[PDB]
Amino acid sequence: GHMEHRGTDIISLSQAATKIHQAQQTLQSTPPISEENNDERTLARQQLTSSLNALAKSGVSLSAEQNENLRSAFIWDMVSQNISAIGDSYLGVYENVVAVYTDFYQAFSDILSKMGGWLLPGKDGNTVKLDVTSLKNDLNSLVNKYNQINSNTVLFPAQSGSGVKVATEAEARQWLSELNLPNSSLKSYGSGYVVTVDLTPLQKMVQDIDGLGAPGKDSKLEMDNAKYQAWQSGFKAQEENMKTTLQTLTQKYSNANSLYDNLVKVLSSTISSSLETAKSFLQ
């Protein structure tokens, strides 16, 4: 126990520091907005835990100060199992939440981009013509696509392959509450439950369109500017509801990513103190 090996300790700790920093670079710069990006993020976490496993077998010994720092934040075996759990069951879910909601919200954006072509001149400068039928039809089509249970619609559990991974009602409700989503986002499927995107603003938009009254013979609805503006204000409010839901989810993702990054910083700082120890000697 008297034989020192500073050279190997420095190489081992440096290797770990490098793998951790590379994973951290990925996790800070890659947005969780597509399956491809989340694959990259998941790989970075696998690389990080592999590096801790390699560090555990290396020979480097931590001090009481460092052992304690690690116990309170999260021995190398326990740190690896704990951080893996957080990446997979917490940050990994949030990444899925954002990628799925991204694509859903993009579909909604594409509908909104058509709305200029659905507003026509009225008979005079006090009236407009809204194509209520085309607008209703596109919105209903979005509802019907995202009302299904598949990899396009399921926020939790994260999905892969051709089966539908489901959770217990208790587990799904926890995530429903965590995500601040309405009860309608909790769906039974087969033997369990899933959490899905919130369609209620779109459904409300469609109701409000019908509330305008039956279209004319062209399937479009003539309205005075006052009626139109009031409808537009109501439509905008529903768009704002969806925007707020997405905003909440992306912020919550970011904080889950910050919580994981705080743990990564503890790892980095532990390794950097050990590196100082390997390089230093009392006069």
User: How, if at all, do strands 186-189 and 192-196 pair?
Assistant: antiparallel
Considering beta carbons, is residue 1 or 125 the nearer one to Ni ion?
1
Considering beta carbons, is residue 2 or 57 the nearer one to Ni ion?
2
Considering beta carbons, is residue 1 or 121 the nearer one to Ni ion?
1
Considering beta carbons, is residue 58 or 200 the nearer one to Ni ion?
58
**1-9, 39-47, 216-224, 246-254 -> range binding Ni ion (CB under 5 A):** 1-9
| Cα–Cα distance list, 121 to 128, 210, 235 (Å) | 5, 21, 20
Region 3-32 residues binding Ni ion, contact defined as CB under 5 A: 3
CB of 4 to Ni ion, least distance (A): 9
Considering beta carbons, is residue 1 or 116 the nearer one to Ni ion?
1
Region 141-170 residues binding Ni ion, contact defined as CB under 5 A: none
Considering beta carbons, is residue 7 or 116 the nearer one to Ni ion?
7
CB of 93 to Ni ion, least distance (A): 48
**2-10, 120-128, 233-241, 264-272 -> range binding Ni ion (CB under 5 A):** 2-10
CB of 1 to Ni ion, least distance (A): 4
Contact status: 57 vs Ni ion (CB under 5 A)? no
Contact status: 1 vs Ni ion (CB under 5 A)? yes
CB of 55 to Ni ion, least distance (A): 22
Which position's Cβ is nearest Ni ion?
Answer: 2
Q: How many residues bind Ni ion (CB under 5 A)?
A: 3
Contact status: 2 vs Ni ion (CB under 5 A)? yes
Q: Give contact residues for Ni ion (rule: CB under 5 A).
A: 1-3
